[PDB]
Amino acid sequence: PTVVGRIPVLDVRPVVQRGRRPAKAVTGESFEVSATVFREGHDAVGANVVLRDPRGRPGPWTPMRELAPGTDRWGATVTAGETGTWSYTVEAWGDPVTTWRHHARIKIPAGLDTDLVLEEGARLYERAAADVPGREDRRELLAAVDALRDESRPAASRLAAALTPQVDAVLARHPLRDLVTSSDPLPLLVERERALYGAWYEFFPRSEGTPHTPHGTFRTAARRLPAIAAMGFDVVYLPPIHPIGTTHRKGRNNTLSATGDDVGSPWAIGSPEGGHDSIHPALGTLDDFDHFVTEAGKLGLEIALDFALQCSPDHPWVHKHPEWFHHRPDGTIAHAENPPKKYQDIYPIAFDADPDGLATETVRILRHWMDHGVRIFRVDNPHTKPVAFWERVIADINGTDPDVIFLAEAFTRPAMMATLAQIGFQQSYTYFTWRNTKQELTEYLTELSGEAASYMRPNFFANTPDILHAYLQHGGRPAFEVRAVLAATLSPTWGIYSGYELCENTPLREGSEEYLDSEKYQLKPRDWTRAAREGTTIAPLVTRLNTIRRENPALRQLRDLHFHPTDKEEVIAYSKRQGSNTVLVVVNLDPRHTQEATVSLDMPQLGLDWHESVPVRDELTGETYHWGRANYVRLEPGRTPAHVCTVLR
Amino acid sequence: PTVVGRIPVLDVRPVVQRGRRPAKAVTGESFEVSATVFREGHDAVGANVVLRDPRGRPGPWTPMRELAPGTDRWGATVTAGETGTWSYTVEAWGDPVTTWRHHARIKIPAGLDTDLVLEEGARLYERAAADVPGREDRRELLAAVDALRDESRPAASRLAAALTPQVDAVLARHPLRDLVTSSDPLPLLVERERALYGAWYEFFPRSEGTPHTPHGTFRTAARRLPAIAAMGFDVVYLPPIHPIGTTHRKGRNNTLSATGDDVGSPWAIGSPEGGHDSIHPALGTLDDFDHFVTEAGKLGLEIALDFALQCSPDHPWVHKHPEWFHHRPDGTIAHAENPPKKYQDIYPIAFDADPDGLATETVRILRHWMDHGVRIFRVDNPHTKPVAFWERVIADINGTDPDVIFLAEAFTRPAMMATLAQIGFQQSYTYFTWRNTKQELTEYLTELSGEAASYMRPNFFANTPDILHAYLQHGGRPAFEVRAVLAATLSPTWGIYSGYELCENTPLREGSEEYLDSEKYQLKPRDWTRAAREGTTIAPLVTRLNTIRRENPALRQLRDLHFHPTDKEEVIAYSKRQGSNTVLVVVNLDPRHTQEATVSLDMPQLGLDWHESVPVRDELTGETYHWGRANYVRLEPGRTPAHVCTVLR
Numbered sequence A, B: 001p002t003v004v005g006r007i008p009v010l011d012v013r014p015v016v017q018r019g020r021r022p023a024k025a026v027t028g029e030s031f032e033v034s035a036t037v038f039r040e041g042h043d044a045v046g047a048n049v050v051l052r053d054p055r056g057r058p059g060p061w062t063p064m065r066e067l068a069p070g071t072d073r074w075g076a077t078v079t080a081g082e083t084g085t086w087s088y089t090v091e092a093w094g095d096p097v098t099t100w101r102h103h104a105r106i107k108i109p110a111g112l113d114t115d116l117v118l119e120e121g122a123r124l125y126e127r128a129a130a131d132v133p134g135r136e137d138r139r140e141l142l143a144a145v146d147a148l149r150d151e152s153r154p155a156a157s158r159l160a161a162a163l164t165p166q167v168d169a170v171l172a173r174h175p176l177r178d179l180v181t182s183s184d185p186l187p188l189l190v191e192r193e194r195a196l197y198g199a200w201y202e203f204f205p206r207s208e209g210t211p212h213t214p215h216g217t218f219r220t221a222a223r224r225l226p227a228i229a230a231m232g233f234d235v236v237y238l239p240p241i242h243p244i245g246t247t248h249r250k251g252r253n254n255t256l257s258a259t260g261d262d263v264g265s266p267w268a269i270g271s272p273e274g275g276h277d278s279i280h281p282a283l284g285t286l287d288d289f290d291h292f293v294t295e296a297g298k299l300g301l302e303i304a305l306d307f308a309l310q311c312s313p314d315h316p317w318v319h320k321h322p323e324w325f326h327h328r329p330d331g332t333i334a335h336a337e338n339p340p341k342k343y344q345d346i347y348p349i350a351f352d353a354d355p356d357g358l359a360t361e362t363v364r365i366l367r368h369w370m371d372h373g374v375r376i377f378r379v380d381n382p383h384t385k386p387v388a389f390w391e392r393v394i395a396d397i398n399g400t401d402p403d404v405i406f407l408a409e410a411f412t413r414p415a416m417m418a419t420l421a422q423i424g425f426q427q428s429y430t431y432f433t434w435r436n437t438k439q440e441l442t443e444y445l446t447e448l449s450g451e452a453a454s455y456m457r458p459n460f461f462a463n464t465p466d467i468l469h470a471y472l473q474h475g476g477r478p479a480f481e482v483r484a485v486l487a488a489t490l491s492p493t494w495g496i497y498s499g500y501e502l503c504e505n506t507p508l509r510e511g512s513e514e515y516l517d518s519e520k521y522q523l524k525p526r527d528w529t530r531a532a533r534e535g536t537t538i539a540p541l542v543t544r545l546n547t548i549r550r551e552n553p554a555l556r557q558l559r560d561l562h563f564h565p566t567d568k569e570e571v572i573a574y575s576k577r578q579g580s581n582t583v584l585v586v587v588n589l590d591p592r593h594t595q596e597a598t599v600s601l602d603m604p605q606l607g608l609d610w611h612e613s614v615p616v617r618d619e620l621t622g623e624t625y626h627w628g629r630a631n632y633v634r635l636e637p638g639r640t641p642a643h644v645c646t647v648l649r
């Protein structure tokens, strides 16, 4: 029994942990399957991808091509249908017709063995025809056989009759494959489209209150949902909605002691009022939450709840399950940390005294919110809990409810980021906020749209309550516009945290990435009506970007992405394609200065010849342009961050 | 059950074909086992490699270290012992003693949590003692426990008592590892030293004849063996020793028609006088071959025979086993080809009619020569026979005779070259002859000494009967000296083909890599005694290089190799280390002009600090130098091709 088969097919990709975990896709997503394929000797090889659905049903004929000369690396694009666990193989084979044609094209004009060459061709086309059904196609090939055998015609005429486009056409659909050799199957987990594609909006319900009751309730926060839906968002991410501890409650601006009216951090979960399966009393009741969920759903919005596996000192778990915490010799539980940050208001969970009880309680809590319509969870700091714990929990939840989506908020080292995605997190936060130059963006997106896409789906939040980047602090509104265009067009999933659209960019202090007067620690009423009337919000641009994504399939996927060269370091250009849809984006990364540049398009990567001209429409403005291999652009910050163009027919 | 364990241990390397083929080593060879290891949170992890022999016996405690900050990539060096099939795993674990010592070193000097931190250490060392079998080792740790708890003693002294050498010694032999998590075993094939290390010499017995009988015999050719052994070679590689066909026999200089006394190519195997298991009548008998092998062995020389699975048209297989060839419709067999080259004198074997018969006959032929003392086979053009055919044949032969070494003469594309090594070829020919500039040599040797070394062992033939490189053609003797130094010091296995040491360098024509009057097609009598009297041979340099290799373990391994920067493109510098042996080589790649350069040594890669001395002896001259971090060299072609230095201790 040999490891290599008759025709080598080696190192099939995508592959995750050597085949022990599934590669990822969503319904309708196209991705490349590749392999190393070659044979002994100099005859031609062919290959094809066999994609099988959860019932074992194979997909269409999907022939492969060598991706670059002399590499023996072959690839083809496949497309996932329904959700479930699929599998794929690569089949490799001797290609006798290509081999014979190449030898006949030489030997016939040279007059070498022409009788043998033509008869071998005749026998070979007969062999091909034996497998073709449909009298017409088989007749086509058999007529080429008879022409090859017709010694009353010149040798070149007999040969030419085997090389007509009509014959190529039959052979294209019904190729003759020798020595077919298959790779072993690899697993593919196909999930619902929202796992890859969607626009996210994060806000704090308690901040959306009234003049007379500043602390919002679920009923007053529900009134914010129409504006969010109107900006074209699909997912609403809420910080924790549970009671908040009082012991070591944090005050405003991340101070260590709260005054009497201070609301504390929502992540300091738990009190005598309840824990992770309960509602903060000032938000109202579970029925109020159901109202919020209902109103969201009527607007096409899905709720994502924060799941933060940790506790305030007042949480019932502290006395109900002491073994879920690490106690020092004096009984104290050290407060959680994520250095250099400190979380004085919470205890971290310890997992090694009662891992079964913790997994049971975790999936209980998730299934409670799932029963109330929550099918997406944003998991807070997953990298401070064991990787295998999430592996278990996610497998459990998705085993009964495969539609549930888990988003990993893991801003940490690459190994942990990648492993969390690989053990089942449907989506991952990314380094996006720290990729701001053209070089950083090009390199990072080349990584994310490449091999990493077989196990990770990025969620590009342009800001979070914890990340106000210096780019936004120093660039003002034109920088907010640039980052929104970049996030919305470079990832099929993007998000903003409320106040982004108002261009809030005052840091806690120079060199910080915290917001001054952060909403994590205080109510943050925002005058949405005034900002809208005065035009001091970028909500219209956000709306337009989400509309462009909804109208352009190229922007609803990740892996098809190509950067085109420009001659200015501050101007980046890239395109994305899905079927006949092509989107071409040119962004001025400079938020302070007008930039002119020549964008030299790689015409073939747009499916075009070098001399063609591409008619494009700038979906941000509706202006039409005529663009060829080389195009002058002039982008004035404030007036326009970018061109977001579709190529027209 | 989860794929990831409690402490993640991921992507263990080396790995070949995802673990379905073994990684390679030889007895006494060191190599690095690496893994991605981390945990949740910020406490310290530890890791170790468990290498198990063919009986499953674990090797010594082999702790790993993180290889670069923030990468979570860990490594440790292991050393292979006796031949056979070994395995290795990586274990990872929480390291509570390291974690506590780091905390205590910060807290105790600041007087923070002193009683609590000291008590944490006390009960931890008590935990470590629980598993210590020896009464005196337990009493050692309990001594530190008692000092840690001694409240009548200064806090600094309580801590210091936990950090003594006596304590460390107990914990090095019984470390406290928490949450120990293991990878699944990976296979390692350990083979005899000659698989990795050896000097090879190829010659044609038929050329070593007499004026009365120009065609040498095994009895006359045996007279070359003293000179070959005196040059310090270990392996004699013979072209095929079988009868040679007459039908379509090639003439001199690869012409298509032999005339009269023409001897033909030895690779055109087979006649009515016998096939692959027979001796050419002009070479003598099987008994004469036995005499040759015996006389070789008495001189410390092993015989490698050429195995060329192909037939002259006169080979008995052509009519006994017609199904071992591809036939055209008139029943004729096309001659073999390897574009752009043509082999009009032979038929290629076909493998798809009777693969079992071909495997059976192949291993029968190999076992015949094995019974006559041939334990090494040079396999001609393996890439024109199926990869899985060699996989099966090599596993069959090595299953009964694991000492047999197979060398793949596959000058082809990278995937096939890599795959042949991976399915079992002990050694591979390489791109060496076509790597002649400093950039070329540095990049290629970086590849060969890096990940390729887990599956392939290079044999650097500086020439072969088919490869006379333009570098040698244009450079003359200084070029032969350079390529010998390079081949001998960059690979633990190197070789030359007879006449290399005479600096034979006349090509068939401008732009060809064939030799004029190639020995493949004619007897080539050489007056060896006269060349040595006239000093036109570099046999003294070849002899010296082989002695240097035999005296310096650093040159008998592959993976430890470092290139040091110089400030002239034509001057390359590199070092190799094995234990306390260090070899430092500086080569002038320019065969025409003297070159002056400053060599700037990466002292840490030598095991030295930047201020230290590098006393070296140039083993080519016996000269001594006092080198340092920056050394001026001057190398004159024809006089000093290189410095080949050992570092003195």
Ligand SMILES: N[C@H]1C=C(CO)[C@@H](O[C@H]2O[C@H](CO)[C@@H](O)[C@H](O)[C@H]2O)[C@H](O)[C@H]1O
Pocket (backbone or CB within 6 Å): A250, A254, A265, A266, A267, A268, A308, A310, A342, A343, A344, A345, A346, A380, A381, A409, A466, A520
């Ligand atoms: N990476 C996330 C992790 C945490 C920790 O749960 C959250 O931190 C917030 O919540 C803590 C507990 O109440 C406060 O101590 C911090 O001051 C405040 O920033 C945020 O989601 C985000 O930083």
Ligand SMILES: N[C@H]1C=C(CO)[C@@H](O[C@H]2O[C@H](CO)[C@@H](O)[C@H](O)[C@H]2O)[C@H](O)[C@H]1O
Pocket (backbone or CB within 6 Å): B250, B254, B265, B266, B267, B268, B308, B310, B342, B343, B344, B345, B346, B380, B381, B409, B466, B520
């Ligand atoms: N890569 C090796 C392959 C072959 C083929 O076996 C050998 O080629 C020699 O043998 C042929 C058959 O006799 C002749 O046709 C060629 O002219 C002569 O070069 C050499 O070992 C080497 O080229």
